[PDB]
C-alpha cells in the first residue's frame, strides 16, 4: 500500500498512489530539476522530520527553488500518514520541482511506500560495496556551485547507474571517490568508519551531502564519550578500519562487510552505533 498527497491551492490533497500527478512538461521529469528528502516512517511517526525539512530548505536554496515552507510539508506528511499502518515501516519522500518554469508555481508532493524487505535485510545482515570514482577533485565542487554539491536532487541517474554497475560486479552499494582517491559518500548514504577508538566521516567541503543520520550518530557519540572526527580518508582507511557503515534516513545503519571483494569484520562495534541511533 502506497499513499500520495499533492500541494494544490495552499492545501494537501490525497490522490490514489496509481494516479498520475505530474504533467509531461514538469521540469522535475524533463530535466530532473528538483530536490527531495527521504523520511523514515516508524510506528506511524516521522521521528526525524525536522532535520529533513531544514535540509530541504538548503537544497531548494542551492537550486533557486521557491519552497512552500515547514507547515506545508508537515500537512502533506500528515495527509499520507492518515491511514498508514503503525506496524509497517515506511519511506516518505518529499519532492519539490521547478514545475512548468520559474514563474509558474513549483510542484510539491509527498509519497509514502513500505521500506522493502531487501533494504530491511541490508540493515539486519549488512552489505558489500564497490569503490567507484566520480572523476572530480575533492576541492573542486566548493568553487563550482553549478555542480549542485551539497543538494539532494532528483538528478540521480548517475547515482543509480553506479549502483547497477556495482550490482553487475556482485556488490550491493557504492562508495564514491574523488580523483585523488578521497572517500566522498554513497549514492544515497554517508560513509562512517571506526579506527583508533574514533568514529570518522569525510568532510562536507568536498561537495558531498551533509547526512542527517551521520550527524545524529556523531551528536549521540559525543554525549556517550565516543570520540568523533571529520577525516579526509581514502579506500585504504576502509580496509584498515575496525568497522565501516553506510548511514541513511531509511535503510539506517548498514554494516559494510566487503569492500571491493575484501571481506572485513566490524570489531563488534555495530551494537553501540545501533544503540546510539535508537
Ligand X SMILES: *Cc1c(COP(=O)(O)O)cnc(C)c1O
Q: Is 144 one of the binding residues for a second copy (CB under 8 A)?
A: yes
SS3 of residue 10 by DSSP? coil
Distance of CA 62 to the CA centre of its chain: 17
Q: Which is nearer to a second copy, 120 or 142 (CB)?
A: 142
Stretch that binds a second copy, among 130-138, 190-198, 244-252, 268-276 (CB under 8 A): 130-138
Using the rule CB under 8 A, is 34 a contact of a second copy? yes
249 is in an annotated binding site: yes
> 209 with 169: CB under 8 angstroms?
no
Q: Residue 116 touches which of a second copy, ligand X, Cl ion, none (CB < 5 to 8 A by kind)?
A: none
Q: Which residues pair with 175 in a beta bridge?
A: 131
| In contact, 112 and 80? CB cutoff 8 Å | yes
Task: Read off the C-alpha cell for 265.
Answer: 569484520
Number of residues that bind Cl ion (CB under 5 A): 2
Cell numbers placing 77: 506528511
**Cβ-based neighbours of 110, under 8 Å, separated by 6 or more:** 4, 5, 12, 73, 76, 77, 79, 80, 92, 93, 94, 95
Contact status: 121 vs a second copy (CB under 8 A): no
Query: Smallest gap, in angstroms, from Cβ of residue 142 to a second copy?
Result: 10
Residue with smaller CB distance to a second copy, 17 or 74? 17
270 binds Cl ion (CB under 5 A): no
Residue 278's nearest CA partner among 48, 37, 44, 39 is 48
Pairing of β 127-133 and β 173-177: parallel
List the one residue from 28, 99, 233, 249 that touches ligand X (CB under 6 A).
249
Q: Binding residue for a second copy (CB under 8 A) from 13, 14, 22, 203?
A: 22
Instruction: Please give the distance of CA 246 from its chain centroid, rounded to a whole number.
Output: 10
* Residue that is written with C-alpha cell 506511524 in the block: 44
188 binds Cl ion (CB under 5 A): yes
Q: Residue holding cell 498512489?
A: 17
For ligand X, the closer of residues 97 and 188 by Cβ is 188
* 209 near a second copy (CB under 8 A): no
Q: Counting contacts by CB under 6 A, is residue 206 touching ligand X?
A: no
- Residues of each annotated binding site: 55, 156, 212-213, 249
Q: Which residues bind a second copy (CB under 8 A)?
A: 2, 4, 17-34, 36, 63-64, 93, 95, 97-98, 109, 111, 113, 132-137, 140-141, 144-148, 151, 153-162, 164-165, 179
Amino acid at each position: 500500500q502506497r499513499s500520495v498527497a499533492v500541494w494544490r491551492d495552499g492545501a494537501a490533497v490525497t490522490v490514489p498512489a496509481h494516479q498520475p500527478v505530474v504533467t509531461a512538461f514538469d521540469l522535475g521529469l524533463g530535466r530532473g530539476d528538483g530536490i527531495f528528502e527521504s523520511v523514515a516512517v516508524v510506528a506511524g511517526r516521522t521521528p526525524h522530520l525536522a532535520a529533513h525539512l531544514t535540509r530541504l530548505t538548503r537544497s531548494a536554496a542551492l537550486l533557486g527553488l521557491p519552497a512552500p515552507g515547514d507547515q506545508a510539508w508537515m500537512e502533506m506528511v500528515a495527509a499520507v500518514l492518515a491511514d498508514w499502518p503503525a506496524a509497517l515501516e515506511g519511506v516518505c519522500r518529499l519532492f519539490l520541482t521547478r514545475g512548468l518554469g520559474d514563474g509558474t508555481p513549483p510542484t510539491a508532493l509527498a509519497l509514502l511506500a513500505p521500506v522493502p524487505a531487501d533494504t530491511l535485510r541490508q540493515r539486519a545482515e549488512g552489505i558489500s560495496v564497490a569503490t567507484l570514482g566520480l572523476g572530480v577533485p575533492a576541492d573542486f565542487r566548493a568553487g563550482a556551485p553549478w555542480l549542485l554539491g551539497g543538494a539532494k536532487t532528483l538528478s540521480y541517474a548517475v547515482n543509480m547507474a553506479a549502483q547497477r554497475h556495482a550490482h553487475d560486479l556482485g556488490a550491493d552499494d557504492v562508495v564514491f571517490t574523488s580523483l585523488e582517491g578521497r572517500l566522498l559518500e554513497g549514492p544515497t548514504s554517508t560513509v562512517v568508519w571506526a579506527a583508533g577508538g574514533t568514529l570518522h566521516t569525510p568532510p562536507v567541503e568536498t561537495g558531498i551531502l551533509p547526512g542527517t543520520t551521520q550527524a545524529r550518530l556523531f551528536t549521540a557519540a559525543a554525549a556517550d564519550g565516543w570520540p568523533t572526527s571529520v577525516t579526509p580518508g581514502t579506500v585504504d582507511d576502509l580496509h584498515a578500519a575496525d568497522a565501516v557503515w553506510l548511514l541513511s534516513g531509511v535503510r539506517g545503519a548498514a554494516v559494510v562487510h566487503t569492500v571491493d571483494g575484501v571481506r572485513r569484520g566490524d570489531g563488534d562495534l555495530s551494537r553501540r552505533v545501533r544503540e546510539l541511533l535508537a
